[model samples]
Target: STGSATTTPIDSLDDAYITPVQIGTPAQTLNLDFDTGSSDLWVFSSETTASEVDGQTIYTPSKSTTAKLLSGATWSISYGDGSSSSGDVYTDTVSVGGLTVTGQAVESAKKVSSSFTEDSTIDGLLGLAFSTLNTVSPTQQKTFFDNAKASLDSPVFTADLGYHAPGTYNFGFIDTTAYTGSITYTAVSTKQGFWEWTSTGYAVGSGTFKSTSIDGIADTGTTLLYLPATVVSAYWAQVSGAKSSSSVGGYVFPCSATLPSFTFGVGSARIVIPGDYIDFGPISTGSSSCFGGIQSSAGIGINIFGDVALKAAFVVFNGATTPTLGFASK
Candidate 1:
C-alpha cells in the first residue's frame, strides 16, 4: 500500500449526465465538464436555488445512493470571466469510468451566475490542467492530483484527448509511447489558469510570416486557436482557394485544396498545424468559406492554443516539485 495510488475512472454523461466515480465502498457521483484551462474540481449541490443556478446539471446528494457531505465547510469559487458560485464541502466515494477514488473533495454550489447557469451543455468544470492555478491554498486544498500523486507510476499526469472523438484521459502514470518525437520541457510559470508560452513565429509551407512573431498562450479552456488579425489574414492569404467565412463569432476559411502546413516554433520545439485543421465547417456568411483553424482576435490581448492543437499531441505538467511543462507525442 506504500507505493500504490488509486485512480477514479470518470464516466461521460450524455443527457442530464452525471459522471460517477467510486470513492470508498459507496459510489459518489458529480456532474463535471472536463476542462483543461485550470486545475480544480467542483460540483453544484441542492443548496443552490433554481433561479441562481442556470442551465447546469445539479447533483442531488440526497438522491445519490452513495453520496456523503463534509461536516461544516462552505466553499465558493469565482472565475476570471466574472462568474461566481458558492457551495458546501463534502466527501464522497466517487467513481469515473471503472476507477474509484475515495474521499475526493467535492463542492456544491449554492449560488451560480447566469452565464454558468445558462450553459446547458456544461454543468461544471473539472480542472485537469495544472496545479499552479489551483483555487485551493496549499494549506486548505487537496486536488485529485495532489492526493493521488503518491500512487502514480511516474508521478506525472497526462491528458490524451480524442477531441470530439472518443478519447481516453488518464492520470497518475504517463505513457511515453503516445508521443513520437523528443519531449520538450518548459519551465512552468506561477500564473493561474492555462500554462501559456510565447511563439517565435509561424510558417506555412514555403511562405513564412516574418512580421507575425507574437506571444501566445496555450489554453485548454478555449475550444479554438485564437490568432492576431495580421497573422490570420497573412496565413490565409497563402492558400490558393481559401475563402473567408464567418462562424463562431470569428472568421473561417473553407477550401477543398490542401493547405500548406504551418509550423509553430516554441523555443526549441517546432509543432506543425496540419492543413486539415485549417479547414473548418462550411460558412453561413454569403461567402463559401469554411471555419479556418485560426481565428482573428484583433484587440484581444492573448493568442490561445485551444483543444484543436491539444488533440494533436501529448502534454504533461510536472507540478510535484518545481513547475515544468513537457510535450510528447499523442
Candidate 2:
C-alpha cells in the first residue's frame, strides 16, 4: 500500500510525468523507465537465458531487427527483493528523443536470472512509476508515457537525473535547463500510491525529532531510508560520536567523522540529507559496516524517502495539472 496512487492535477510548471518515448531506432536506442509504479515497457532480449542480475541492466534485441514479438504474452515479476522474473510478450516501435510511439507493448524477458542475465548494461525497466503498477494487461498495457501523452509539446515529463552517475537512474524530458530556484510545489496525496509528503520533523546537527511532523512517502520503489526508531534515534544523536549500530540498522558515525546535514521538513520545503548520506563504508572486504544515509525501518509504516531522498531533489510529479508535487535544484 505504498501511497496508493492517484493524484493527477497539476496546472503549470509545465506538467510532466515522463514522455520521451523511443525504444529502438538510431542503430538501436532504448531509453525507457517512465515508471508510474508499474505498467511495463521491459526490454533486454537476445533471448535472455539467465546469467546476470546482480544490480540489473540487460537488453539485447540483437540490436533491433525492428524488434517485435507478442506471441503468447507471458510475464512474471516479483520484487520486494525476493527477486523474480519470467517473460515473453512483445511489440516494438518506440521512439522518444524525437517522440514516436507506435504499437509499443513490450516486455521481452526469456528467462532472466544471472541477476538479470549477465550485466549487458541495463536494457530494461521502463514502467514510468505508476499506472496501477502495470506489468501490462489492460489489453496489453502500453506506456511510453501512455503512448506519448498526446504528443507532448509540454504536457511534460522531466527526469534529467543528470545523465546517469550517482548510482544511475535517469529518465525523460523536463530539463528547464536543470532549474535553479523556485519549485517547491507539493499537494498530491490521493492516498498513497506514493509521492505523498508532510514531514516537518527530522533534523540533525541541531537535534529535533519528537516525531516532528511525520506523514511522508516519496518512494521510487524504495532503495533504503525508512526511518522511525524515534526518527532513527534523533538521527544517530547528531553523529558527532555516533553509535547505535543495531548491527547494520542505523547510526555508525566515525568513518572519519564529519557527517552532519540532515534536514527534512516538507511544508516549507526543506529536503537536505547529505552527510555522505549519513556515512557509509564496507561494500567489500568482510563486508558489514556500511551505514550512510540513515536507516532503521521502524516497522515501515510511513516515512520512506528512498532513492536516497530522491537523489537530492529535482523530483516533479505534477500528474497532469494539480494533484501537485514539485521540488527544485537538479
Candidate 3:
C-alpha cells in the first residue's frame, strides 16, 4: 500500500531521471526512467541480444522462482523521437520505494533501439501513464502504481524533479515542505491516456499574459519543452541573436544572449519558466552556441511540458476517481 522511493537524476547529465526498483524474489535492482508519457514497464532482460545491451545491467527473470511467464502475450513500443523496445511478458514480484506488487507484468525486451541500447545507465521505463495506454497484446498490464494503489495511504504521487539535483518521487503521501505557496488544482483530461490540460494563455517575460488557449501534456519522459510554432517563434523573436537553424532543426541562440522568462497559464495560475531554463544547454560540445528549449512542436497539435518545465514545479499526480494535477513552485 504505502511506499517511498528515491528518484535520482542520471549522474552524467542525461535529460531523464531514474529510480531504483527491485524485481522478482531475490530482488535484482535496476535503474529505470520514470516516464509519465507512456504506459508499460519494459526492461532489459536475458532475452535481449548481448550486442544490443551496451554496458547496461540485464534482468534475468529465470533466476527468480516467483517469476511467472505470461504465455502468448507480447509488446512493442516506439516513441516520437524514434526510441523503441519490444519483447515477451512475465509476471513477477515488482517493488518500488517500499511497496511491492505481486503478479506485476514485466516486459522483458528482446529487441531495443539504438537510443535505449546505447544508454548504459537506464534499464527500462517505469510508466506513470494510465494503464489504458499499455502496449501488452492479448493481455493488458497495469503499472506499478496502479497495482499498489489500493493499499496506499493516499492514491497520489508527487514528482519533485530538481534541476541538476536529486529529486524525490513520493507515493502514498505528500510532503508539504517540498514547495512554497499554495498548490493550484487543475482537472486533467485523461481521455487520451495522458495527464493533459488546456492552458488559458502565455506571455514572454514581463509582457502581458495572452488569452490564447494551449492544449498540452505534462510529459516527464521527454527532455525539451515544445509549443506551437507561432508561440515558439514569438519566444525566440525576443532574443537579439536567436534564429532558426536548419542544422540544429530548431532555434539556436548565442550562449550569452539575454533571454526572457516564459510564463504560461494553468487555468489562471501562471507558471513561469526562468530565462536560464529557456536556454537549454549548449547545442554542440565545447560550443558557445546553445539551442532554445522552447521550440516548435513540429506540427504536433499538443504542446509538451517536458523536464525543463516540470523541474520548476512540484507536481502531484492525483489518481483518484477524477484524476487531477496539483502544481506549486518548488
Candidate 4:
C-alpha cells in the first residue's frame, strides 16, 4: 500500500513543516511536525498542564474508546533548541494521510517547554528517524513508519520539501512525477538512529567544487544547514557585510547582501540551493541584518543538512533490508 500527504510550512520563514494526523477511535486531528531527527511519536494531550497549553490541539484519550494506557511506559525527549516534552504512553489507532495503524504507541505529553507552547502551529511531533532512537523507558516502541513498512509495497518513503510552499511526503512508493531527474543513492548509517550520509563535496555559487567528504544527517526537524567552519566561512566570505555575531547566536549579514547559491554533491549528483534561500530572513521585524540559513556546526559535534538543504532536492529514506538514502533534483 502507498500513501501521500501534503506538508505545509507554518510561516513565511518556513521554520517547520506540519501535517494533519488523526488519532483515536473518533479521529481527533492534530497538526504535527514530521521530524526525521528524532524517534518518539508524541503529542500535546489532555494530560498536559493547563498553563503549558497554548492554542495547540490536544489529544483526549478519555474520549477515545480504542485508547488504552500503556501501564508503566513513559517518555522524555529534548531537542537541539533546548525545548523538551515528556509524558505517559497509550496505544491507539493512528492515521497519517490515508495510511492507518492500529495499536500504535502514542506518547501523551504531560509537560512541554516554553518554546513548544509558543509555537501554536504544531501540536507535537511524529518521529521519522530509526526506532532505536525512541525514548520510552523500559520499552522502546517502533515509529509509525517502522510499524507500517512491512505491510507496504516497499519499505521506503520520500521527502519533497519546499521553500515557501507546501511539500509532499510519500510512503510505500516513489512518485516519479515529483522529481525531474534520476535519483542518486547512498548508503545510510543508522547506528546513531539518524539518516546519516556523506556528501562528495560543495561549491559556493559558481566557484570550483571543493572535493571533500562531508558527513552529515538529513534532518527535517532542523531549520538550518550546519557545516564545518571552513565551509561556512567560505560561503559568508563571499558576502560583503557578513559577520559571525555572538549576540545574534550565528552568522548574520545585511539583508540586501547578494548571497550566493550553495551546492553539495551526492555521489555524482549535484544539488544547488538558490541564494534567496540562504538569506534566511531578517533577524527581527524591520531589521536590516538577516540571519544566514547556513551556519557553522563546529559547536554541534556533527554536521546537519537541515530543511535548508533538504528543500533543494527530493530525498528518499529507503528502509529496505539494507538502509539507503536517495537524492534527486526537482
Candidate 5:
C-alpha cells in the first residue's frame, strides 16, 4: 500500500510544515507537524489540561471504541528550542492520507509548554524519526512509518517541501516527476535517531565551492538553516549591509540588500537555494532589517539543515535495516 498527503506552511516565514492526520476509529482529524527530528506521536487530547488546550483540536480517545489505554505507560519529549510536552499513552487505529495502521501508539498530552499552546496552528506532532528514540517508558513503541513499513510496497518516504506553497509527502514510492535530475544517494547514520548525513561542500553565492565537509541533520521541524560560523560569515560578507546585531539577535541586514544564493553539495549533486529564500523575513512586522535564514551553528553543538535548506531540494528517507538518504535537485 502507498499513501500521499499534502503539507503546507502555517506561516509566511515557513516556520513549520503541517499535515492532516486521522486518529482513532471515528477518525478525528487534526493538523500535525510531521517531524523527522523526533520520535513520539503525541496530540492535544481530552487528557490535556484545559489551560493548555488553547485553540488546537483535541483527540478524544475515550470516544473511540478501538482506543485502549496503555496502562502505566507514559511519554515525555523536550526540544532544543526549549519546547516540551508529556502525557499518558494509548493505542488505536491511526491513518495518514490513505495508509492505515492498527494499534498505533498515540500519546495524549496531559501537559504542554507555553510555546505550543501559544501557536494554535498545529494540534500535535507525528514523529517520523527512528523508534529507538521513542520516549514511552515501560514499553517503547514503533513510529508511524515503522508500523506501516511492512505494508508499504517500498519502505521509504519522500519529503518535497515547497517555498510558500503546499508540498507533498509520499510513502512507499518516490515520485519520479517530483525531482529534476538524478538523485545522489548518501549513507545515513541513525545511531542518534536522526537523519544525519554529511555534505560534500558548499558555495557562497557564485563563489567557488569550498571542500569543507559539514555534518548535519535534515530537520523539517526546524525553521532555519544553521551552518558553521565560517560558512555563515562568508555568505553574509557578500551582502552589502549585513551584520550580526545584538539587538535583533543573530544576523540581520537591510531588506534592500541583494542576497546571494546558497548552494550545498550532496555527494556530486549540487542543490542551490534562491537568494530570496535567504532574505527570510523582516525582523519585526514593519522593520527595515531582515533576518538571514542561514545562521551560525556555533553554540548549537551540531549543524542543522532545516526547512530553509530542505525546501530547495527533494529528500528521501529510506527505512531499511541500514538506512540511507537521497537528495535530488528540483
Candidate 6:
C-alpha cells in the first residue's frame, strides 16, 4: 500500500492555517500556508532583501547541496486581497508530512507586500491548487503535489482546518476517522485555476435551503467566508445588531448578537456552519463589537469558501482526471 502523511496545521491569528514543510538537502523546516487558492511552492529565502525578511524563516538554497537554480526563472504572484510576492526560482527537495517531492521548484521571494512581511510567522506557501495555476516564467512550475501525485495510490488530498484550534492536511489518502457519515462527492468546475463549485442553494438559520446558483472557489489561503453581496446581506439580516461599518470594516455587530447558522447546499449534501463561527471575534480595538466571519466578495470579484466555512467540513480534493470535492461533517 502506498503510504500517506497527515500534517497538523496550526491556527494563525484566526487568519490562516500553517503546516510544516521541509525544504532543501539538509532539510531546513519552514511553516507554510497550504494554499489551495494558488499553485506555487514559494519560500522566504536568503535571496529575499534583508530588510523585508523580518521574522520569516528563510530557506537558504546555497546551503543545500542538492539545490539547483532554475537560472533566469522568476515568479510573481498577487492575491485577491492585494498581497503580492515575487522572486527567483530554485529546484530542491521539498517535503511535507513525511512525503517528499525531489527537484521541486521553490520560488524564493525577493519582494513581499506588508501583508506578508508583517504577518507574524508565515515563512512561505505550499500551493495545493492545480498545477496549471503555477506562476513560473519560461516554464511553469509544478506544485509539490503535482510531482508526487503519480507515485500515490490515490490522486487526492484532504483539508481539515480548525477554528482557533489545530487541524490536518492529509495527502494521497483520506482519514475516515476525521469525518462522520459518507463523504458526499460533487463535481467541480476548474476553469479559473481553482476548485470552483456551485452551491445548489443556501439558507440562513433554520430557513429552507434555497436552490440558488452560487459559484465560488474553495480557498484555504483565505481567512473568512466570502459570499456574493446578496448572500452576505441575507445572512447579516438575520443577526439582530449586525450592521455595515467601514470603521471596523465589513459587517460588525454587538458582541452579544446571536447569529444563525449559515448553510450551503452542495449537490444533495448540505454544510451548516455554526453561528459561533460566524461571529469572528471582538474588533482589534477591543470594542463592544465583533466582525462577522461571513463577508461580501464584492470588490474581490470572487466568492471564496475560506477557512471559516472549510473548518466545518472534512474536504477531499480529488485531483484525478475527474476533479470532484468530497464533503462530510467534521
Best by lDDT: 4
Candidate 4 local lDDT, 236-299, one digit each (tens):
9999989999999999999988889999999988999999888778899999999999999999
Q: Global lDDT for candidate 3?
A: 0.87
Query: Can you write out model 3's per-residue Cα lDDT over 1-330, one digit (the tens) per residue?
Result: 667777777753437888999998899999989988899998999999888999877889989989989999999998868888899999999888888889999999999999898789899999998999999999888988888888899999889887778788888888999999888988899999998977788899888888998888888888878988888888888998899988888899998898999988877688888888776768888888888888899756678988878888998989999999888887
lDDT tens digits, residues 204-264, model 2? 7655533466666666544456767777776676656666666565556656667777777
Q: What lDDT tens digits, residue by residue, belong to model 5 across residues 1-330?
A: 998999999988888989999998799998999998988999999999999878999999989989999999999999878999999999999888799999999999999999999999999999998999999998999999999999999999999998999999999999999999898989999888999999999998899998878999988888889999999999999999899987877999899888999999998889999998887778989999999999999988889999989999999999987899899988
Candidate 6 wrong stretches, greater than 4 Å: 1-13
Top TM-score hit: 4
Measured over all alpha carbons after superposition, the RMSD of each candidate to the real structure, in angstroms, is: 5.4, 15.5, 1.4, 0.7, 1.0, 1.6
Q: Comparing 4 and 6 by TM-score, which wins?
A: 4
Better of 4 and 6 by lDDT: 4
* Residue pairs of candidate 5 with colliding backbone atoms: none
lDDT at 241, model 5: 85
User: Each prediction's TM-score against the native?
Assistant: 0.73, 0.33, 0.96, 0.99, 0.98, 0.96
Off by over 4 Å in 3: 11-14
When 1 and 4 are scored with lDDT, the better candidate is 4
What lDDT does each candidate get? 0.59, 0.55, 0.87, 0.94, 0.92, 0.86
Q: Count the backbone clashes (under 3 Å) in each candidate.
A: 24, 53, 1, 0, 0, 0
Which lDDT tens digits does candidate 6 get at residues 269-328? 889999988876788767888888999999788899998889889999999998999899
Q: What is the number of residue pairs that collide in model 2?
A: 53
- Candidate 4 C-alpha error for residue 222, in Å: 0.3
Which regions of candidate 2 deviate over 4 angstroms?
Answer: 1-40, 43-46, 53-89, 92-103, 107-124, 129-145, 148-202, 205-237, 240-262, 267-290, 294-305, 308-316, 321-330
Query: What C-alpha root-mean-square deviation, in Å, does candidate 5 show against the real structure?
Result: 1.0
